Amino acid sequence: MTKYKYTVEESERFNKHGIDLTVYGQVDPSATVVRVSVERGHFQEFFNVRSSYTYYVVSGQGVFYLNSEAVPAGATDLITVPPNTRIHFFGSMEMVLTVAPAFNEQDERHVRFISESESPY
Ligand SMILES: O=c1ccn([C@@H]2O[C@H](CO)[C@@H](O)[C@H]2O)c(=O)[nH]1
């Protein structure tokens, strides 16, 4: 009766600002968990007024820019970002992303686009 398991095969997969997102389709007000694959960067800076963003780095290496501060990231690191923090990042990484409470695009604000040449990856 209750669906507990979600697969990649049945997920929604799309590119957003240079990252490949896997959105599984589960609904839970307390948190959203998605996969993020990135080859060079997330070429847009945004913030979320409600939700914290927590990235677990499965593999690879990159750099987060959090309110313009560089934060290097590598495999097995956890990057925790409070609400109302400007975010972008560069890197070649596979990550698991938690947005808590649940992701709502109406909570997000566009700051600026980032030139693809700005990524050193
Ligand atoms: O469920 C989610 C979680 C994050 N993002 C997007 O992922 C990027 C940051 O990893 C941002 O563009 C953010 O809007 C989504 O589209 N959906």
Residue numbers in the entry: 1 to 121
Copy text from the publication:
In pacidamycin 3, biosynthesis the 3′‐deoxy moiety is mediated by Pac13, an enzyme found to catalyze the key dehydration of uridine‐5′‐aldehyde 1 to form 3′‐deoxy‐3′,4′‐didehydrouridine‐5′‐aldehyde 2. In stark contrast to most characterised dehydratases, Pac13 is small (121 aa), monomeric, co‐factor independent and utilises a non‐activated nucleoside, rather than a free monosaccharide, as a substrate. Pac13 is the only monomeric, metal‐free cupin dehydratase characterised to date. We demonstrate here that the reaction most likely proceeds via an E1Cb mechanism, with H42 acting as an active site base, however, unlike many other dehydratases, no metal or cofactor is required for activity.
Mutants E108Q, K16R, H42Q, Y55F and Y89F were produced and purified, affording diffracting crystals of the same morphology and space group as wt Pac13, which raised our confidence that the mutants folded correctly and that the effects seen are specific to interactions with each mutated residue rather than global effects on protein folding and structure. Y89F demonstrated a significant loss in activity compared to the wt. Finally, the significant loss of activity with mutants Y89F and Y55F is consistent with their proposed involvement in stabilizing the oxyanion and underlines their important role for catalysis. Similarly, on examining the Y89F–uridine complex and Y55F–uridine complex structures, we observed a high degree of similarity with the wt enzyme. Although there are subtle shifts in the position of both the ribose and uracil rings, of the substrate, and in the orientation of the 5′ functionality, these changes are small and consistent with our hypothesis that decreased catalytic efficiency of these mutants is largely due to inability of the phenyl mutants to stabilize the transient 5′ oxo‐anion that forms during catalysis, rather than having a major effect on binding competency.
